């Protein structure tokens, strides 16, 4: 099927009242033998996170082209940039070559540092423009958290409230999935600081 | 086949400047005499516009540009070398942010990146620089307003009030009389008409002194009645009849 | 000051040329002495090439192209090593594509825009190299005069080189003599001969250094050295 | 000054003619083709005292069976590497044979002269056409030994005996009378070194001086230090026997 | 014509050396005076301004000195326009290094690869070359501080204190005679206050002609950090030295 | 060095020498042309010499057309002078391939300029001194007029012409604009506005002419025509019977 | 200062034969240009005139004349035949820091 | 120094480079070649200069004809007569690939022009430096353009070259008195011979010999033809029975 | 780009790119070497006067080639550390190709390969780069000493020195060094160095360097107060009158 999901895993984000909640696995390998235990793919620069889905040529080697020309912004501009802003040159790198782009949809969740609204971002694989006000993710195993969090998350949530929303919610959708599992990790975005917190799941 | 002269411009001189550079401010001596200022409250960019024939209209002629809403910009010296910038600008702009990102970089990087290409012209062999110096403001994101003076070597000058044209060390002195915390929009366009207009001589009308204000945004200038998730194109120019208004005023 | 008109390459003089073709023109005579003529049916070129030394030898101008036709170059040949090899594969490339017998025309009109595009184009030095090609063709032998200002032309016969014009004119009265009669290609050679004797003022009649070509309707073309002169000296 | 394009009053480039002076600035050669094998040789004179002869070459080897030489700056010397030894594989490559001399020095004239102001196909960026004097010498199959040179200007003659290098007005006026159908190799060693001892300033030394020899079956062979003193010696019992 | 304007500015002069690398000096003569020091803490950048005015805005404030990393800055010496090129260049390159090891790169591996930017002008292309003289400062796990300065002509060399612009060799003297193995970040501001008042011609010093920025080790943790100084804190600096003007 | 005979540099004065002796003779042509906007239409007139019995008055024009709506005044150099009308040409036809609407005279006008512009760039390649003056009918608009300078500019003008006599006809003309206050003209009838543009061009000549001695032209609403020798011969016995 | 361009117009070859260069002064001649100047000078007996000699930048005869006029018209004002140490250095630094420039170039 | 010979890239007070002016006198020195616009037709002439009895006539035609509906003829130098002829037919050739018709004469003066007026912009180019004669018969009718050195082409019922080029064309205007549109052009090619005769009386030195190619609008409808047997003594015994001394 | 050439060819031979290219090495540092039996030693100098660096943290002179060979030399800085690292692929070209290191005779070729380019073809200037190339062979503890001309020419060498005034240093080495008799201790080669070095730069030992190149990839640079050890030994008996 798809060459970037030999590895699997899934990057969930979503959106609650003065906060954003996004979250990913540990899980690492190839088809149904895993190899990287301490794998995470939320990466971070700035005050906003970017979550990254597929194969480790596109995720970890691509990573050193995100930081590019983010440095060159954190060089020359010495400032934030809206979550807004990032995700065109995500979406324009995807489409420069049509023949051969990337197959790794990011995910993008962060905080405004000017206005201090919540906003998410981050496409799929070909760069569908996809935004919302909930959640946004991204994978194979996407398709289950597109109606988890409709049963599940409530406008204008706590942090507190929304940590328990995507957690559970993760927790659950990887030990359905085979290309996800072997731990979750999760990011609480505030205004300034970020709260780590690990979490214990099914092993096998 | 084309192109076969390699070699650079003019070598040092026992000067140490270059005097490509040195002979490009006697255009800007010799040309239109612009100005501008920063009142934190709008940007206002007025000049003047040499007619030396009465068959000539001056309505085609239009030395404020516009490369992007919030930034505007006008020159000084030759004409047709700021022309041709504006549509090399409005293609690196194409290809800078503007489509990487969703919005153009500031002012203060984005004229960096095209007077990097002025100095550009300074260097490589075959092309000559220009004779023209550029007095470019705009709006910026955090900084608020921004104004910026542009030799033809590229280096930006981060001013608050200034002139260049013909007469321009009297019509500076002026300037820096006349400051404070903060200033309005209006007084830009009084200060300006006290100092542009009295500094030369011959052109009384509006038609022959073009002028453009920065800060105002009128709804008719949008184009569409949906969400506005940004102000508008701040950037505003009088026309004829609303120039020769403001020289009424004093 | 004549480094405007004579050193620059597309500057034009007062009278209308270049003063780099007036050098060109000189290099015939600085160079070997040749003798060529056409008799029709047979065809017959005499070219005597001094040494620089007794124990030295010289070196060959005359190319070989094919059968039916061939070529002896005056004056030097700096360039010729590349130009003449580059027109011998330009023999055989008309041979062995457009099947041409490559008369003296076609062969002297793309030579004449050849050393006009390096005063044309700039980065490049002109020839001036003189070549006097002969050929074969259904309407018989053609000789073709090619002078660094890329003259195109035919004549019955030319010497050009050091002293050579007593050889040109002198031979003008008996020319017609020589074309009409054929068949006999030694009496034509030793036409060529006592041409050697009027171009040398100063000392005798050589043998290796004398060369003599030979090329015909049955008879292919060839070069004669050695032994071959023998009967001819 | 000006255009490289500029000619002689009689046609001719100024880097050519003006090429023979940089042949006397270099080492006096004189190489001879007799009935048996072909000598070579060249003078490496001093330029100091500690200088060591032993890892500088002067006589260089594009085949087997023939031989090259150098008289002049050596940085020419080297565009031959890739060029005339190329050019001698390049025959093998295709006809498998040894290449005619006669052939071989035409072959080579076409890679050794290109040059001019600038053109797109063929490379004229070379400035000066020659600063060296190479010696080209050989067997051929079918006449026999071959004893040609490569001019500073780029052409090329048959030499029965050629001198080159500064002394070569001097040598190469007594070398009409010296060389003849008769010589041999035994008889054209010492007749080398008793040239030389008129041309090279100095003492004949083993390190002032480098010989070679070109024959048809062993091929192209250095006289080491050791065999050079040997014809050192030999020449100074010839010339005291002379008289 | 295309030859008898061309002189070969870029080739051997008849004086044994290259005319641009010659007057380009009296260029960096012309170009402000920057004075770098590397204390124990920290490095030391100081800068001057061309004509500076009242309504002269200082927000970003750098021109003559910028900051490649946390870790390493650079600071220039000539016209600004033609460092700018170089500016971002060295960053490109240093972005390369992220792609390549994914680490911090030391300064003396980006010092000579600039140098044959403008040395391959002269090589070949018949281009010309800057006359802006680069002054490089950075961190190291290794060697410490590191605090070096090139020129025009391709030559790097160590400096504890450097100093370039106007008065070179006057600056340089007080410097060395005035040098202390042991200096803090406020022991070698105050060295430089007074030296940079020497250099020019103005009326002592003031915070609107003077361009700053250091780095130290550590804020709130004890190491990889650097801020550019604004210019109000620039005046602060002038009460806490204790040098009024 | 120094001078700009050969090369282009910046002279002491601010003013290039090349842009001099363009600026300078626009007049060795000796030849003179007027242009005038009407109403709803253009008229333009150019003045025509014919120097010989051979020459066919046909082929001889300094208007051409370049699109259906467009117009062109050209005065200069003849062997120059089509040197922008065939790029211009070129350039109208890019104009439909790369929109599919008729050339806007704000485009054609600046295209020419910035393309003589970039030859201030370029010291190797000459830019063209001759005047142009690109003339046409818009829809929206009306009549405009821009005269493209060699150094690069170019601005509205309601008229123009060539020569030394411009500032003579100018005169005349802003009498007349200055009391009605208009720009082009506002009388229609574009047939006694021909005749209305050679009363001017009479008062700096002096002279009549016959049919084949003036070139004149009308730009109407989304047409451009030539009059032939029968409709100019007209309007010239016409105009004595008004005035 | 350069006679270069100048000279093979003029000099010709055997008419006029001099060639004489500025050389930069060794340990030995520094000495002797600076010690013979003093001897008809008085200065402190506890200065040594070799201390400045050991590391100094290209300081010749021509320098050498106006550190001995400076420090000597500094001592002077006070109305004495001696210089003291200060005034040793102080003549020095303005010299070099006036006329004495060098290239920037090191290494090399 | 001057530069207008130099230089062809610079501009001239009189509109004209002295480069350009050069290229006049090249022509002018050549042989004399006119050119004949009728109703029936166009026809060329050309003169071969005999400078030895070693030249063979009937031989050399500096008469290029493109295809057979269209006519041209140089003058001056060789090579840049030549050069043209490549240039023009390769673009005849164009013309049919693409169109798949004939070019008319209009048609192909403007690849003429585009030529000159190129070579004159760069400085490295060296321009043409001789004049161009060309015509034929197309779908419309008989037309004739003549090339100049500096570029500048237009319509010419004659056209005359080399030595007397204004006196040759005055016994043009006489037969356009005579026939106002020319009408029988067959007697315009005994006229012809008439008029290089007129050249004959100053010029002559040597054996002349005359060759005229030429194409018509009636006879030939586009096809070419050649002037031989009966019909060349006949023109040439016309120009001498007028002056028989 | 450039279609012309950079270089014009001399009547008599006397060109105005070999004239200074030699030159560029008279106004640069000396670079002193001599050879030995199982090593090579190559000395140097600084012409900075006040030193404010270290000489590990700024490197001069020192470059390396193979594991066992350093190479040393002083014509320029700029143009001379661009053949350096052209060797240096060119060393490595010879272990992705030969697979074994490379002999020092090409290592010289190599250098004056990249200049021989530079006097023939234009559109590129040449240096005045003059190397003194060192180091040995694989499996051979024989050092090799080759003067690198920027005209291309080289020469087997053993005392040979290149610098200021570096004729007449050689001139000592002449004699009282014998090139048959060559020195066998390694400290021998430093005693004769020594007391050339001190010809030149004369005081200020901070900018005398010594580098000695040993086998099985030893490199030991000498300090200051292994220097002054020596310069005692030279004023004992030659200040002595027999």
């Not at chain 1, 359905?176 to 096998?204: F, H, T």
């Not at chain 4, 007005?169 to 040239?195: D, F, M, R």
């Amino acid at each position: 099927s798809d060459p970037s999901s030999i590895n699997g895993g899934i990057v969930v984000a979503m959106t609650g009242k003065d906060c954003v909640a996004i979250a990913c696995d540990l899980r690492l390998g190839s088809q149904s033998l895993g190899v990287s235990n301490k794998f995470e793919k939320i990466f971070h620069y700035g005050h906003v996170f970017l979550g990254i889905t597929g194969l480790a040529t596109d995720v970890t080697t691509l990573n050193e082209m995100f930081r590019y020309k983010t440095n060159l912004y954190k060089l020359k501009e010495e400032r934030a940039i809206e979550p807004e802003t990032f995700t065109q040159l995500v979406s324009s790198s995807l489409y420069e070559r049509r023949f051969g782009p990337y197959f790794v949809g990011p995910v993008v969740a962060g905080i405004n540092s000017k206005s201090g609204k919540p906003f998410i971002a981050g496409f799929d694989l070909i760069g569908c423009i996809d935004e919302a006000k909930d959640f946004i993710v991204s994978g194979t195993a996407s398709d289950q958290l597109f109606g988890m969090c409709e049963s599940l998350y409530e406008p204008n949530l706590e942090p507190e409230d929304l940590f328990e929303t995507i957690s559970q919610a993760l927790l659950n959708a990887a030990d359905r999935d085979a290309l996800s599992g072997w731990g979750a990790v999760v990011y609480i975005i505030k205004k300034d600081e970020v709260v780590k917190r690990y979490l214990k799941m099914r092993q096998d | 086949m084309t192109d076969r002269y390699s070699f650079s411009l003019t070598t040092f001189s026992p000067s140490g400047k270059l005097g490509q550079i040195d002979y490009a401010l006697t255009a800007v001596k010799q040309g239109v005499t612009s100005l501008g200022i920063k009142a934190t409250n709008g940007v206002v960019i007025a000049t003047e516009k040499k007619s030396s024939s009465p068959l000539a209209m001056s309505e085609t002629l239009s030395k404020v540009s516009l490369l992007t809403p919030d930034i505007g910009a006008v020159y000084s010296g030759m004409g047709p070398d700021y022309r041709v910038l504006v549509d090399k600008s409005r293609k690196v702009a194409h290809t800078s942010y503007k489509r990487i990102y969703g919005e153009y970089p500031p002012t203060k990087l984005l004229v960096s990146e095209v007077a990097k290409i002025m100095q550009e012209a300074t260097q490589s062999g075959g092309v000559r620089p220009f004779g023209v110096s550029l007095l470019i403001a705009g709006h910026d994101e955090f900084n608020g307003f921004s104004l910026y003076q542009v030799d033809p070597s590229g280096s930006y000058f981060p001013w608050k009030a200034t002139a260049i044209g013909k007469g321009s060390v009297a019509a500076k002195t002026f300037l820096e009389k006349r400051w404070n915390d903060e200033l309005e929009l209006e007084d830009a366009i009084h200060i300006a008409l006290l100092t542009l207009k009295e500094s030369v001589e011959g052109e009384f009308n509006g038609d022959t002194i073009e002028l453009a204000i920065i800060g105002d945004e009128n709804p008719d200038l949008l184009g569409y009645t949906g969400i506005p998730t940004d102000k508008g194109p701040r950037f505003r120019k009088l026309t004829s009849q609303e120039i020769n208004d403001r020289l009424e005023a004093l | 000051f004549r480094n405007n008109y004579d050193g620059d390459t597309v500057t034009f003089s007062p009278t209308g040329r270049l003063f780099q073709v007036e050098y060109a023109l000189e290099a015939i005579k600085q160079g070997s002495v040749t003798v060529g003529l056409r008799s029709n049916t047979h065809a017959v070129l005499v070219a005597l090439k001094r040494n620089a030394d007794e124990l030295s030898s010289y070196q060959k101008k005359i190319i070989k192209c094919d059968e039916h036709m061939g070529l002896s170059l005056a004056g030097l040949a700096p360039d010729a090593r590349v130009l003449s090899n580059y027109l011998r594969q330009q023999c055989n490339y008309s041979s062995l594509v457009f099947n041409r017998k490559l008369a003296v025309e076609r062969a002297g009109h793309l030579l004449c825009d050849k050393a006009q595009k390096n005063t044309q184009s700039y980065g490049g030095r002109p020839y001036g190299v003189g070549l006097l090609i002969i050929g074969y063709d259904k309407s018989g032998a053609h000789l073709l005069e090619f002078q660094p200002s890329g003259n195109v032309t035919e004549l019955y016969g030319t010497a050009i080189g050091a002293r050579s014009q007593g050889a040109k004119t002198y031979l003008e009265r008996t020319l017609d003599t020589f074309i009409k009669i054929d068949g006999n290609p030694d009496e034509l050679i030793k036409a060529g001969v006592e041409a050697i004797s009027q171009s040398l003022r100063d000392e005798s009649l050589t043998v290796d250094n004398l060369s003599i070509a030979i090329v015909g309707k049955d008879t292919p073309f060839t070069i004669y050295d050695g032994e071959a002169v023998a009967k001819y000296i | 000054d000006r255009g490289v394009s500029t000619f002689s009053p009689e046609g001719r480039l100024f880097q050519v003619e003006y090429s023979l002076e940089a042949i006397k600035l270099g080492s006096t050669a004189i190489g001879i083709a007799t009935k048996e094998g072909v000598v070579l040789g060249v003078e490496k004179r001093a330029t100091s005292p500690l200088l060591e002869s032993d890892s500088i070459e002067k006589i260089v080897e594009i085949d087997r069976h023939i031989g090259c030489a150098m008289s002049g700056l050596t940085a020419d010397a080297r565009s031959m590497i890739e060029h005339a030894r190329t050019a001698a594989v390049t025959h093998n490559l295709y006809y498998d044979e040894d290449i005619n001399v006669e052939s071989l020095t035409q072959s080579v004239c076409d890679l050794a002269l290109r040059f001019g102001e600038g053109a797109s196909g063929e490379e004229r960026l070379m400035s000066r056409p020659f600063g060296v004097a190479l010696l080209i010498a050989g067997h051929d199959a079918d006449d026999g030994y071959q004893l040609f040179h490569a001019e500073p200007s780029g052409t090329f003659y048959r030499y029965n005996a050629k001198a080159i290098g500064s002394g070569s007005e001097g040598a190469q006026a007594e070398l009409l009378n010296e060389w003849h159908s008769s010589l041999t190799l035994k008889e054209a060693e010492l007749l080398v070194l008793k040239i030389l001892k008129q041309v090279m300033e100095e003492k004949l030394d083993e390190n002032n001086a480098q010989l070679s020899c070109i024959t048809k079956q062993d091929g192209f062979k250095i006289y080491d230090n050791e065999k050079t003193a040997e014809l050192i010696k030999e020449l100074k019992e010839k010339e005291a026997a002379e008289s | 014509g295309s030859r008898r304007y061309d002189s070969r500015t870029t080739i051997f002069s008849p004086e044994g050396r290259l005319y641009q690398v010659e007057y380009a000096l009296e260029s960096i003569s012309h170009a402000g005076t920057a004075i770098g020091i590397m204390a124990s803490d920290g490095i030391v950048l100081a800068a001057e301004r061309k004509v500076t005015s009242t309504l002269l805005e200082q927000d970003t404030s750098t021109e003559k000195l910028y900051k490649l990393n946390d870790k390493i800055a650079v600071a220039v010496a000539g016209l600004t326009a033609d460092a700018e090129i170089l500016i971002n260049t060295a960053r490109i390159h240093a972005q390369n290094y992220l792609k390549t090891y994914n680490e911090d790169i030391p300064v003396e591996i980006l010092v000579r690869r600039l140098s044959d930017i403008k040395q391959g002008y002269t090589q070949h292309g018949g281009l010309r070359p800057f006359g802006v003289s680069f002054i490089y400062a950075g961190y190291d796990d290794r060697y410490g501080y590191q605090l070096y300065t090139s020129n025009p002509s391709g030559n790097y060399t160590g400096w504890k204190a450097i100093s370039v612009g106007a008065n070179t060799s006057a600056a340089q003297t007080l410097l060395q005679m005035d040098y202390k193995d042991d200096m803090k970040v406020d022991d070698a501001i105050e060295l430089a206050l007074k030296t940079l008042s020497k250099t020019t011609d103005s009326s002592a010093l003031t915070y609107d002609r003077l361009e700053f920025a250091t780095i130290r080790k550590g804020a709130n943790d004890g190491e990889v950090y650097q801020k550019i100084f604004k210019p109000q804190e620039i005046k602060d600096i002038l009460v806490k030295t204790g040098i009024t003007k | 060095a120094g001078y700009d005979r050969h090369i282009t540099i910046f002279s002491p004065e601010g003013r290039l020498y090349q842009v001099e002796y363009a600026f300078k003779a626009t007049n060795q042509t000796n030849i003179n042309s007027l242009a005038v906007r009407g109403k709803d239409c253009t008229v333009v007139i150019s003045q025509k010499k014919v120097p010989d019995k051979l020459l066919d008055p046909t082929t001889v024009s300094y208007i051409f057309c370049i699109s259906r709506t467009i117009g062109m005044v050209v005065n200069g150099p003849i062997p120059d002078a089509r040197n922008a009308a065939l790029r211009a040409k070129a350039e109208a036809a890019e104009f439909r391939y790369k929109y599919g609407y008729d050339m806007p005279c704000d485009v054609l006008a600046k295209r020419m300029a910035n393309l003589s512009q970039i030859y201030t760039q370029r010291a190797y390649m000459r830019p063209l001194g001759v005047i142009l003056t690109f003339v046409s009918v818009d829809e929206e608009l009306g009549p405009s007029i821009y005269k493209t300078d060699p150094a690069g500019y170019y601005v509205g003008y309601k008229a123009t012409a060539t020569g030394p006599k411009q500032q003579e006809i100018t005169t005349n003309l802003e009498n007349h604009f200055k009391k009605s206050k208009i720009d082009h003209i506002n009388e229609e009838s574009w047939e006694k506005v021909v005749e209305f543009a050679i009363t001017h061009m009479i008062d700096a000549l002096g002279t009549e002419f016959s049919k084949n001695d003036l070139e004149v032209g009308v730009a109407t609403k989304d047409k451009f025509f030539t009059l032939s020798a029968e409709n100019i011969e007209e309007r010239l016995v016409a105009i004595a019977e008004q005035d | 200062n350069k006679i270069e361009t100048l000279d093979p117009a003029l000099i010709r070859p055997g008419r006029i034969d001099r060639k004489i260069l500025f050389e930069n002064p060794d340990l030995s001649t520094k000495k002797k240009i600076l010690g013979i100047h003093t001897s008809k000078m008085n200065l402190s007996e506890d200065v040594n005139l070799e201390t400045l000699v050991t590391t100094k930048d290209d300081l010749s005869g021509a320098d050498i004349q106006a550190m001995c006029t400076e420090a000597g018209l500094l001592a002077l004002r006070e109305r004495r035949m001696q210089v003291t140490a200060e005034d040793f250095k102080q003549a020095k630094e303005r010299v070099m820091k006036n006329k004495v420039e060098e290239n920037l170039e090191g290494l090399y | 120094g001057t530069g207008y010979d130099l230089s062809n890239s610079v501009f001239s007070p009189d509109g004209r480079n002295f480069q350009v002016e050069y290229a006049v006198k090249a022509v002018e020195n050549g042989t004399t070649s006119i050119g004949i616009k009728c109703n029936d037709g166009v026809v060329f002439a050309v003169e071969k200069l005999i400078t030895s009895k070693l030249l063979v006539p009937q031989k050399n035609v500096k008469i290029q004809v493109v295809d057979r509906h269209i006519g041209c003829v140089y003058s001056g130098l060789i090579p840049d007569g030549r050069h043209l002829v490549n240039r023009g037919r390769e673009e005849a050739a164009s013309f049919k690939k693409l169109y798949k018709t004939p070019i008319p004469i209009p048609a192909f003066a403007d690849r003429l022009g585009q030529y000159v007026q190129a070579h004159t912009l760069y400085n490295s180019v060296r321009p043409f430096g001789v004049s161009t004669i060309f015509g034929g018969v197309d779908k419309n009718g008989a037309h004739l353009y003549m090339l100049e050195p500096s570029g500048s082409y237009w319509g010419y019922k004659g056209a005359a070259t080399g030595k007397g080029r204004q006196s040759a064309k005055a016994e043009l205007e006489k037969l356009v008195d005579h026939h106002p549109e020319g009408l029988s052009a067959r007697e315009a090619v005994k006229q012809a011979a008439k008029i290089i005769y007129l050249a004959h009386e100053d010029n002559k030195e040597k054996d002349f010999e005359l060759e005229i190619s030429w194409c018509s609008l009636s006879e030939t409808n586009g096809l070419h033809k050649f002037v031989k047997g009966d019909l060349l003594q006949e023109a040439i015994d016309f120009a001498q029975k007028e002056i028989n001394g | 780009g450039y279609d012309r050439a950079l270089s014009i060819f001399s009547p008599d031979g006397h060109i105005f790119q070999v004239e200074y290219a030699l030159e560029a090495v008279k106004r640069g540092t000396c670079a002193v070497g001599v050879k030995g039996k199982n090593c090579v030693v190559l000395g140097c100098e600084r012409r900075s006067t006040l030193k404010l660096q270290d000489t590990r943290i700024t490197p001069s002179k020192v470059s390396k080639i193979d594991s066992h060979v350093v190479l040393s030399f002083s014509g320029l800085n700029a143009d001379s550390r661009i053949l350096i690292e052209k060797a240096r692929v060119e060393a490595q070209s010879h272990r992705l190709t030969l697979e074994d290191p490379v002999t020092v005779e090409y290592l010289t070729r190599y250098v004056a390969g990249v200049q021989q380019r530079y006097t023939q073809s234009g559109g590129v200037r040449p240096f005045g780069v003059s190397t003194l190339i060192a180091g040995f062979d694989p499996r051979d503890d024989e050092p090799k000493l080759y003067q690198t001309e920027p005209s291309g020419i080289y020469s087997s060498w053993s005392a040979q020195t290149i610098g200021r005034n570096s004729k007449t240093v050689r001139e000592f080495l002449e004699k009282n060094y014998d090139r048959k008799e060559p020195p066998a201790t390694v400290e021998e080669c430093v005693k004769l160095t020594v007391r050339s070095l001190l010809e030149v730069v004369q005081t200020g030992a901070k900018n005398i360097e010594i580098t000695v190149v040993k086998p099985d990839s030893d490199i030991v640079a000498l300090s200051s107060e292994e220097i002054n050890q020596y310069v005692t030994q030279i004023e004992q008996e030659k200040q002595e009158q027999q």
